[PDB]
Design a protein around this ligand. Structure first.
Ligand SMILES: *[C@@H]1O[C@H](CO)[C@@H](O[C@@H]2O[C@H](CO)[C@@H](O[C@@H]3O[C@H](CO[C@H]4O[C@H](CO)[C@@H](O)[C@H](O)[C@@H]4O)[C@@H](O)[C@H](O[C@H]4O[C@H](CO)[C@@H](O)[C@H](O)[C@@H]4O[C@H]4O[C@H](CO)[C@@H](O)[C@H](O)[C@@H]4O)[C@@H]3O)[C@H](O)[C@H]2NC(C)=O)[C@H](O)[C@H]1NC(C)=O
Ligand SMILES: *[C@@H]1O[C@H](CO)[C@@H](O[C@@H]2O[C@H](CO)[C@@H](O[C@@H]3O[C@H](CO[C@H]4O[C@H](CO)[C@@H](O)[C@H](O)[C@@H]4O)[C@@H](O)[C@H](O[C@H]4O[C@H](CO)[C@@H](O)[C@H](O)[C@@H]4O[C@H]4O[C@H](CO)[C@@H](O)[C@H](O)[C@@H]4O)[C@@H]3O)[C@H](O)[C@H]2NC(C)=O)[C@H](O)[C@H]1NC(C)=O
Ligand SMILES: *[C@@H]1O[C@H](CO)[C@@H](O[C@@H]2O[C@H](CO)[C@@H](O[C@@H]3O[C@H](CO[C@H]4O[C@H](CO)[C@@H](O)[C@H](O)[C@@H]4O)[C@@H](O)[C@H](O[C@H]4O[C@H](CO)[C@@H](O)[C@H](O)[C@@H]4O[C@H]4O[C@H](CO)[C@@H](O)[C@H](O)[C@@H]4O)[C@@H]3O)[C@H](O)[C@H]2NC(C)=O)[C@H](O)[C@H]1NC(C)=O
Ligand SMILES: *[C@@H]1O[C@H](CO)[C@@H](O[C@@H]2O[C@H](CO)[C@@H](O[C@@H]3O[C@H](CO[C@H]4O[C@H](CO)[C@@H](O)[C@H](O)[C@@H]4O)[C@@H](O)[C@H](O[C@H]4O[C@H](CO)[C@@H](O)[C@H](O)[C@@H]4O[C@H]4O[C@H](CO)[C@@H](O)[C@H](O)[C@@H]4O)[C@@H]3O)[C@H](O)[C@H]2NC(C)=O)[C@H](O)[C@H]1NC(C)=O
Ligand SMILES: *[C@@H]1O[C@H](CO)[C@@H](O[C@@H]2O[C@H](CO)[C@@H](O[C@@H]3O[C@H](CO[C@H]4O[C@H](CO)[C@@H](O)[C@H](O)[C@@H]4O)[C@@H](O)[C@H](O[C@H]4O[C@H](CO)[C@@H](O)[C@H](O)[C@@H]4O)[C@@H]3O)[C@H](O)[C@H]2NC(C)=O)[C@H](O)[C@H]1NC(C)=O
Ligand SMILES: *[C@@H]1O[C@H](CO)[C@@H](O[C@@H]2O[C@H](CO)[C@@H](O[C@@H]3O[C@H](CO)[C@@H](O)[C@H](O)[C@@H]3O)[C@H](O)[C@H]2NC(C)=O)[C@H](O)[C@H]1NC(C)=O
Ligand SMILES: *[C@@H]1O[C@H](CO)[C@@H](O[C@@H]2O[C@H](CO)[C@@H](O[C@@H]3O[C@H](CO)[C@@H](O)[C@H](O)[C@@H]3O)[C@H](O)[C@H]2NC(C)=O)[C@H](O)[C@H]1NC(C)=O
Ligand SMILES: *[C@@H]1O[C@H](CO)[C@@H](O[C@@H]2O[C@H](CO)[C@@H](O[C@@H]3O[C@H](CO)[C@@H](O)[C@H](O)[C@@H]3O)[C@H](O)[C@H]2NC(C)=O)[C@H](O)[C@H]1NC(C)=O
Ligand SMILES: *[C@@H]1O[C@H](CO)[C@@H](O[C@@H]2O[C@H](CO)[C@@H](O[C@@H]3O[C@H](CO)[C@@H](O)[C@H](O)[C@@H]3O)[C@H](O)[C@H]2NC(C)=O)[C@H](O)[C@H]1NC(C)=O
Ligand SMILES: *[C@@H]1O[C@H](CO)[C@@H](O[C@@H]2O[C@H](CO)[C@@H](O)[C@H](O)[C@H]2NC(C)=O)[C@H](O)[C@H]1NC(C)=O
Ligand SMILES: *[C@@H]1O[C@H](CO)[C@@H](O[C@@H]2O[C@H](CO)[C@@H](O)[C@H](O)[C@H]2NC(C)=O)[C@H](O)[C@H]1NC(C)=O
Ligand SMILES: *[C@@H]1O[C@H](CO)[C@@H](O)[C@H](O)[C@H]1NC(C)=O
Lengths: 123, 242, 358, 107, 86, 49, 49
């Protein structure tokens, strides 16, 4: 399994940027996709996730980017997109395209991130 | 004439994690000098209404039995606790009697009450139904006034994600087939929100569930004999000559 | 959570055989309403020297009920052998509105030992054990009678000196002859009267320990005990369930010699009971010393109307089942046990529907 | 929020632990805490999930442990090659969000 | 019961003056008559002094009166000029 | 809302008298202006005939 | 209603007195005699306010 991530670069605050990534080695239509970010000197921070098409491809977002970032996916290409409608200076961070899975079962679930891509810098 | 005794113990309620709506807890009070204010005083009540009993009577008369049903509840969902509610929660998770006198209290929990713990999130059942032995015919399964959800034994203490389905086959005793259900979640609010159901029963026993009043020597049966008096004996009122 | 003691530490369960043909006997003891047999006294009010009608949960007149018996286990001289029970373990029945049971029905009568076709003995009273719950399925080997999640278990103990009641999850043991082990048949409680029924030292845990040998107790909500006076007086016990929990009735504590049943306890069981079963019980007695035991009879209750005769002593002595037959209805109609001669009208006979058409 | 030690260290061959605490709603009731290892300049990898078990790509030096409302990562016989930033991650299903600790410098 | 069609064919249901359903046109093209299920009227012959009784089954032909009719069920019967008496 | 009279009729009938009782009131406590209520308003501050 | 289900005759129960009489007895055949019928209502002219 490999996750290829690109689309980083520098955009002045007030503007916008879109990241994307491509999955290979996995069945795209059968996994959840998610994004996290990490600013220099800081720990990890969750951005948001998207469900499978069969699940309505719904989304959930972290509070830090609520109403600003939007996630989407396209199973015809095995790619994921993250568009940042309105950037702030505080959004300077390395972003990572990753997958998300659940263990256990429906009775007692446990969530974790198994695969990670290289990441891309947004500044 | 009333018995002396002890006050209603609400400690259990205040000393653990709030139950879910479809898996609530029931406290039954008998032989008790109750104090409604004491309990409600501990919460920043949002609402409190009653049916087939006055706001006065609910905390002034004597009952044969008092039932308190408590559970976690999203304040915003109060619209579906009505007797004539739409049903998404009422018909599956929790319903109240329309025959006995009842009340409903909705309240938030203050920061001072640190003895009661906070749930991860709210959960409830969206639907619950049975599949027949032909594995083609489905029939809804609703909950009654003093019952638990018909598939409470299937749904886990929490719903991890919306749409989670739960299924188990039925034994021959039930006619066979399958019992199936699915639920959803609601985000937790800044402060814990909780609901309390009250049911009041009369006449099935001595009405020994009463308020707490003091007494005097001039309100005894003795020394009043032969005279026309009014009376109240363990909740039984009337007029006559002893 | 209530701590109900340690688990059993035995490596295997006690082998129990099932030879049903030894239990297939019949001693009919139907409800006789004219003697107020099985009538539960009104809870709210008393009366004196009057005749009135009343609605409540009563058995049908003429109902034979379901007879259940217990037997001695096998033995070789002074050494007990595997147990001997009826096929009660798979006898799962609906609870409905609850039930009442006649206890000591044949006390003081002469009979025989179930496991010995030609051994006579005096019949003595024995208390019934019950298991109640909301859901039942199969055991690991496909046998029926496994109650799931929490169950309500009632076990007379101490050779009939105490009643114990508790609400716990039953976790099957995996040893030989156990519910989740090899060569499983059934489970049963038992006692060994040789040492368990000592006059100056009754084993008040004999039956409970025997129970534990088959199932472990988990997540117990409560456990209560009540005392029992030892005698051979015929008595009644009843169980029902309402919004208030489970109600336990007994004639002993109020009307020992009259039979009117009164409530004596309530259990905090708010989980609707749908099914119940009779718990098997065997006595590990000496081969040379066996007893005969009174049968007990279980009857179903229904929301029926009865005419009740309240004597001058405040107790009910006679009653009429107003729906039994036509003449019975006539007495109820006049609210009297004395009706003049003549020709009277009664309720008609109606037919119930057959298979529907759509 | 999850609380972790700023840093943990010891000599190669020694046993060290990295704690991760919260309350009954975070750690106590459910076994759902995971641990990640991030090398400088690299993406994180999963070390442990469900407070107990590791992916087949992880050596037995790393094991999960829980006590009360405290979760921890145990590194038995630590090597100098284990130097990394370790993170504690908590996440349930819906109607919530992913919580990370500040990370622990392990050296 | 199987019977002769009455009324207008398009309407499936035939009603009486009392607005009760008395007939129906079936999906199979047949017409059936419909009547309410009938009960059996009963009276009790009671003799106080001898403490006994007998059951008089209305005006039944005594054809539909089986034995063991002494109970509602939730010498045998005989037909007389009155009705059937047990 | 109205009681024992329609919201329409109240706007167009004739009366012997009409009484208007006005006061400030937070919308957030709407539920306590009814007959059956928690009490903080209906028992101690204002009740409707 | 005829046996074939068709309506062959009808009475307008608001037409006149005799018509009402037939409707009153729900029949097209009534007995001779003198019968009471609905009285004539007064009809108002322009209102007074
Ligand atoms: C009222 O009571 C009922 C029971 O009476 C209870 O439901 C039962 O819950 C238990 C769990 O507590 C169910 O038992 C098992 O649960 C696990 C759940 O996952 C956990 O455990 C697995 C174990 O490895 C972990 O990996 C996982 O991470 C979790 O920790 C299920 O996975 C089990 O499924 C088995 O059977 C399936 C049948 O097709 C198999 O496909 C599956 O692979 C599992 O097989 C295993 O067991 C077989 C037993 O013979 C064995 O042969 C296989 O080789 C293999 O070992 C299993 O479900 C139990 O089934 C539930 N019963 C029902 C009817 O639902 C209720 O929840 C309780 N109600 C309440 C409210 O508490
Ligand atoms: C059903 O349940 C309700 C609710 O619990 C219960 O009502 C409560 O009754 C108790 C008393 O039984 C009330 O508590 C206090 O009562 C005293 C009574 O006054 C006399 O006694 C005091 C004793 O020192 C004398 O000083 C005084 O002169 C009288 O003799 C009140 O004085 C108390 O008032 C306090 O709060 C006021 C406002 O906050 C202050 O202005 C006043 O100075 C008092 O403050 C003092 O006490 C505080 C206690 O926490 C303390 O924090 C302050 O620093 C200061 O010391 C107070 O009322 C209680 O309030 C009642 N609650 C309600 C809602 O009415 C019913 O009695 C019960 N029913 C039955 C049958 O038992
Ligand atoms: C026949 O079957 C009966 C079944 O009921 C069985 O009786 C039960 O025995 C168990 C013990 O095996 C009882 O459970 C508890 O036992 C302890 C014994 O004290 C020793 O062990 C404790 C363990 O930590 C030590 O700390 C202690 O120093 C001793 O070593 C009792 O102390 C317990 O009493 C509790 O309730 C009292 C009520 O007033 C309290 O005052 C007391 O502080 C205890 O409260 C604590 O435990 C409660 C548990 O329900 C809990 O709710 C409280 O909050 C608190 O934590 C307790 O007895 C069990 O209760 C017995 N059954 C009943 C009905 O009492 C017989 O032993 C068995 N016979 C044989 C021969 O096996
Ligand atoms: C198996 O066999 C045992 C005996 O081996 C048998 O138990 C015995 O049952 C009989 C009853 O059938 C008990 O004898 C008496 O029963 C009456 C019950 O009321 C009936 O009789 C009265 C008589 O007028 C009627 O009015 C009433 O309507 C009923 O018909 C009890 O009331 C008797 O109790 C006496 O002793 C009590 C002790 O405190 C007194 O409180 C009470 O007032 C009674 O005292 C009177 O009689 C005494 C006799 O000596 C006298 O001394 C007093 O001064 C006073 O006059 C009494 O019980 C008999 O006692 C039972 N035996 C035992 C050991 O309990 C089982 O029933 C039988 N089982 C089966 C299934 O057949
Ligand atoms: C139905 O009944 C069952 C069995 O009785 C209950 O399950 C038990 O639940 C209790 C929780 O109260 C579990 O408690 C165990 O405590 C052990 C002791 O350490 C703790 O307590 C001491 C007390 O001073 C503290 O000092 C210490 O810091 C700890 O707080 C723990 O070691 C046990 O941990 C177990 O799981 C972890 C998970 O990875 C393992 O690593 C451990 O080695 C160990 O296995 C545990 O915390 C008890 O173990 C439970 N039993 C079982 C079999 O699971 C049910 O909860 C009960 N249900 C209901 C509704 O009552
Ligand atoms: C425990 O074993 C007993 C005895 O084998 C079982 O009871 C028996 O159940 C059968 C049901 O098929 C009864 O048969 C009945 O026979 C009459 C005869 O006319 C018939 O009319 C009925 O329709 C039916 O066929 C049989 O009589 C009955 N025996 C007794 C003594 O009651 C019992 O069901 C077994 N319990 C379990 C849990 O397996
Ligand atoms: C749990 O145990 C019960 C038994 O009490 C199982 O039900 C039983 O399932 C078998 C399936 O083969 C049924 O056998 C039937 O026998 C008749 C005999 O002619 C045959 O015609 C049928 O085709 C079938 O073979 C048996 O009757 C049935 N028992 C009852 C009471 O219905 C049940 O399936 C077990 N549960 C599970 C999950 O296995
Ligand atoms: C059923 O009746 C028996 C009567 O023997 C009751 O058991 C008895 O209970 C008393 C206490 O109320 C025991 O006396 C003393 O209890 C203290 C308690 O800590 C103990 O320290 C003393 O050494 C002494 O035991 C009495 O011994 C005890 N009897 C026996 C045989 O143990 C029993 O509680 C009654 N059960 C019910 C449910 O009412
Ligand atoms: C249900 O009722 C209908 C209506 O009476 C029955 O149909 C009728 O059946 C009779 C014969 O039993 C038909 O009369 C004659 O039948 C012979 C048969 O070959 C035919 O050749 C004659 O020309 C004449 O039809 C009658 O016409 C027929 N009516 C209709 C409307 O078809 C029907 O049989 C009854 N069903 C049962 C099960 O009794
Ligand atoms: C219980 O009721 C009976 C009647 O149902 C009472 O007996 C009657 O008492 C009156 C009183 O004057 C007499 O005139 C009747 O003749 C009595 N009837 C019979 C058959 O003797 C009986 O006294 C009442 N018992 C009590 C304790 O009040
Ligand atoms: C009672 O028995 C007598 C027997 O004599 C029946 O009377 C006979 O009824 C038959 C019926 O056709 C007549 O032919 C006989 O002539 C009758 N005999 C006499 C003497 O009249 C009588 O009908 C029976 N009653 C009932 C109700 O069965
Ligand atoms: C009633 O009389 C007794 C007599 O000693 C007295 O002690 C008690 O206080 C009196 N009660 C009242 C309320 O006066």
């Amino acid at each position: 399994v490999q996750l290829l991530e690109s689309g980083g670069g520098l955009v002045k605050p007030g503007g916008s940027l879109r990241l994307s990534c491509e999955a290979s080695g996995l069945t795209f239509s059968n996994v959840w996709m998610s994004w996290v970010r990490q600013a220099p000197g800081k720990g990890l921070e969750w951005v948001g996730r998207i469900k499978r098409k069969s699940e309505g491809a719904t989304t959930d977002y972290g509070a830090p980017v609520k109403g600003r970032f939007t996630l989407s996916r396209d199973d015809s290409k095995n790619t994921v997109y993250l568009q940042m409608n309105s950037l702030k200076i505080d959004d300077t961070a390395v972003y990572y395209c990753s997958t998300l899975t659940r263990g256990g079962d429906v009775w007692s679930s446990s969530y974790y991130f198994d695969y990670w891509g290289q990441g891309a810098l947004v500044t | 004439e009333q018995a002396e005794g002890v006050e209603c113990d609400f400690s259990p309620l205040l000393s653990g994690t709030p139950p879910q709506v479809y898996n609530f807890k029931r406290l039954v009070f008998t032989n008790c000098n109750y104090n409604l204010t004491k309990l409600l005083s501990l919460f920043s009540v949002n609402d409190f209404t009653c049916s087939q009993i006055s706001p006065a009577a609910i905390a002034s008369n004597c009952y044969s039995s008092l039932i308190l049903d408590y559970f976690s509840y999203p304040l915003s969902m109060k619209s579906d606790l009505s007797v004539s509610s739409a049903g998404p929660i009422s018909q599956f998770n929790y319903k109240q009697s329309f025959s006995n006198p009842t009340c409903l209290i909705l309240a938030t929990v203050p920061h001072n009450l640190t003895t009661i713990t906070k749930p991860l999130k709210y959960s409830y059942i969206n639907k619950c139904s049975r599949l027949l032995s032909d594995d083609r015919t489905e029939v809804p399964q609703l909950v009654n006034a003093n019952q638990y959800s018909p598939c409470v034994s299937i749904v886990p203490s929490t719903v991890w994600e919306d749409g989670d389905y739960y299924r188990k086959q039925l034994s021959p005793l039930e006619g066979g087939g399958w019992l199936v259900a699915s639920g959803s979640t609601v985000a937790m609010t800044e402060q814990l929100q909780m609901g309390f159901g009250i049911t009041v029963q009369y006449g099935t026993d001595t009405n020994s569930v009463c308020p707490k009043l003091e007494f005097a020597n001039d309100t005894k049966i003795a020394s009043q004999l032969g005279n026309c008096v009014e009376y109240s004996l363990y909740g039984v009122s009337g007029r006559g000559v002893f | 959570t209530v701590d109900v003691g340690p688990d059993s530490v035995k490596s295997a369960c006690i082998e129990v055989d099932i030879q049903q043909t030894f239990f297939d006997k019949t001693w009919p003891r139907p409800i006789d309403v004219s003697k107020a047999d099985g009538i539960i006294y009104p809870q709210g009010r008393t009366y004196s020297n009057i005749t009135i009608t009343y609605q409540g949960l009563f058995p049908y007149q003429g109902d034979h009920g379901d007879m259940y018996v217990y037997s001695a286990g096998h033995a070789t001289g002074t050494t007990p052998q595997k147990l001997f029970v009826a096929n009660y373990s798979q006898d799962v029945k609906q609870f409905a509105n609850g039930f009442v049971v006649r206890i000591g029905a044949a006390a003081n009568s002469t009979g025989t030992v179930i496991i010995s076709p030609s051994t006579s003995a005096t019949i003595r009273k024995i208390y019934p054990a019950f298991m109640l719950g909301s859901s039942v399925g199969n055991f690991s080997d496909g046998k029926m009678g496994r109650f799931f999640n929490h169950t309500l278990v009632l076990l007379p103990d101490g050779c009939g000196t105490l009643l114990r009641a508790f609400y716990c999850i039953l976790e099957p043991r995996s040893g030989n002859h156990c519910p989740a082990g090899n060569s499983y048949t059934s489970f049963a409680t038992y006692h060994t009267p040789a040492t368990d029924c000592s006059d100056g030292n009754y084993n008040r845990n004999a039956s409970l320990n025997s129970f534990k040998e088959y199932f472990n107790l988990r997540n117990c909500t409560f456990m209560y005990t009540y005392n029992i006076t030892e005698d051979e007086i015929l008595e009644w016990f009843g169980i029902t369930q309402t919004a208030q929990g489970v109600h336990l009735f007994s004639s002993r504590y109020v009307d020992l010699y009259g039979g009117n049943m009164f409530q004596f306890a309530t259990l905090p069981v708010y989980d609707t009971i749908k099914y119940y079963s009779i718990i098997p019980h065997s006595i590990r007695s000496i081969q040379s010393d066996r007893k005969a035991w009174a049968a007990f009879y279980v009857y179903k209750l229904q929301p029926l109307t009865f005419l009740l005769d309240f004597s001058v002593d405040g107790y009910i002595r006679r009653a009429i089942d107003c729906g039994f037959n036509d003449l019975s209805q006539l007495h109820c109609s006049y609210e009297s046990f004395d009706v003049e001669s003549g020709v009277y009208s009664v309720s008609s006979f109606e037919a119930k529907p057959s298979g529907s058409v759509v | 929020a999850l609380t972790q030690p700023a840093s943990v260290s010891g000599s190669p061959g020694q046993s060290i632990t990295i704690s991760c605490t919260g309350t009954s709603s975070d750690v106590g009731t459910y076994d759902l805490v995971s641990w990640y290892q991030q090398h400088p300049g690299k993406s994180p990898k999963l070390m442990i999930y469900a407070d107990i078990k590791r992916p087949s790509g992880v050596s037995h030096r790393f094991s999960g442990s829980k006590s009360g409302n405290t979760a921890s990562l145990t590194i038995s016989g630590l090597q100098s090659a284990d130097e990394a930033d370790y993170y504690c991650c908590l996440y349930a299903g819906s109607s919530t969000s992913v919580i990370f600790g500040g990370g622990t410098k392990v050296t | 019961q199987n019977c002769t069609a009455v009324g207008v064919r398009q309407q499936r249901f035939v009603y009486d003056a009392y607005q009760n359903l008395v007939g129906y046109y079936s999906d199979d093209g047949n017409y059936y008559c419909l009547r309410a299920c009938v009960s059996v009227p009963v009276s009790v012959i009671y003799d106080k002094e001898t403490k006994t009784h007998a059951t008089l089954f209305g005006s039944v032909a005594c054809e539909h009166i089986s034995s063991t009719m002494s109970q509602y069920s939730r010498y045998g019967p005989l037909q007389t000029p009155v009705g059937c008496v047990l």
